[PDB]
Amino acid sequence: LGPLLVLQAGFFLLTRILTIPQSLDSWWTSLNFLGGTTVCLGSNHSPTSCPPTCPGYRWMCLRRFIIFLFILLLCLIFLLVLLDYQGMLPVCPLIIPIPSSWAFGKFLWEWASARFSWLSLLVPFVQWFVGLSPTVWLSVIWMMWYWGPSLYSILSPFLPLLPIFFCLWVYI
Amino acid sequence: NITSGFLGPLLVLQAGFFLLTRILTIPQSLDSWWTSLNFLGGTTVCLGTSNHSPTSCPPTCPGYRWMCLRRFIIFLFILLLCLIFLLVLLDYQGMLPVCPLIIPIPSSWAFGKFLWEWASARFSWLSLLVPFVQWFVGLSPTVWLSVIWMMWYWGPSLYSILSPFLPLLPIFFCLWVYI
Ligand SMILES: [Zn+2]
Ligand SMILES: [Zn+2]
């Protein structure tokens, strides 16, 4: 009795995972428009779910595949985070006792700061911003969500004059 | 002296401008490419005129917010991809010291070796599928190409039995009961 239920649950969860790409590419295709789907060029079916006869269906499958690939990658990265959180990646820090946790992250950041040498200047600013934002981060996300495209639109006309006087500054 | 002295830094300025303007549009190119994948390789129109493509919304159009979002999202992925690439490069030089599971550090692909060894350790059944894959390589390459092409031909036929798929767990479950 138990094993039948276990197998049914496993199959249903596998179906959920396999249909995730449907939902995800449908969401992204919604992003293309003002939050609303469309109709595949050629019964007017959305290009996120075409019938097998529809030519776009072939494309859809390819699309479903790529999304799925990214998902796995994300999952992998997510997995790769947890191990790094738990300190199961015994990465030797640049010259020694091991970093109990986040060894990979600390090593990677140390290497980047040591080599690129401008992230050294960037890090103080980012640390300032994050530390000063226990809750300000939430508000600036809201501002970015609303004003961010707007401020980008206002800065963009002066976006190309920006390199000109940046060059002037570099000359001086 | 003065001529070349000025041109040098200014040459760097011009080259930087050109490279940044060529490489900062890649989010737009990839967004347009995916939107093309959505409709058999075509642009279509936005919801808002001149019928501009939805990946090049003017600021007046309401989609410029929307577009930016996905453009930004695409931009993020690029960094991630780049990061992967960067990692995929560093491991080759062995610049990632990862101690192997129980000792000298691996000369190259240390991170890849540790990850694969740990993953194989965690799942015993996974390795069971490894040999057949090699056999797939070990089989006739032409046979593998024919199989893949038939699957492409059988993809629509693959899901032509998609409706019977749902009962698959029950009947197999029934087998598990009778097993
Ligand atoms: Zn279609
Ligand atoms: Zn638009």
Numbering used by the authors:
A (entry chain B): 9 to 50, 58 to 110, 150 to 226
B (entry chain A): 3 to 50, 57 to 110, 150 to 226
Describing publication, verbatim:
Small spherical SVPs are protein–lipid complexes formed primarily by S-HBsAg dimers and are the major format used in prophylactic HBV vaccines. Between H2 and H3, there is a hydrophilic domain known as the “a”-determinant or antigenic loop (AGL), which is essential for the viral infection process.
To obtain a better map of the HBsAg dimer, we expanded the HBsAg hexamers (3 × 2 mer) at the top using C3 symmetry and focused the local refinement on a single HBsAg dimer, yielding a map at 3.60 Å averaged resolution. In addition, H5 is highly curved and is further divided into H5a, H5b, and H5c. On the intracellular side, instead of being a flexible loop, the CYL forms a defined structure stabilized by a CHC2-type zinc finger motif, with C48, H60, C65, and C69 coordinating a zinc ion. We found that mutations of cysteines on zinc finger (C48A, C65A, and C69A) abolished the surface expression of HBsAg, while cysteines mutants in the transmembrane domain retain robust surface expression, suggesting that the integrity of zinc finger is essential for HBsAg maturation. Interactions between the two HBsAg protomers involve multiple residues at the bottom of H1, CYL, and H2. N40 also makes hydrogen bonding with the T37 of the other protomer. These non-covalent interactions stabilize the HBsAg dimer near the intracellular side, complementing the inter-subunit covalent disulfide linkages in the AGL on the extracellular side.
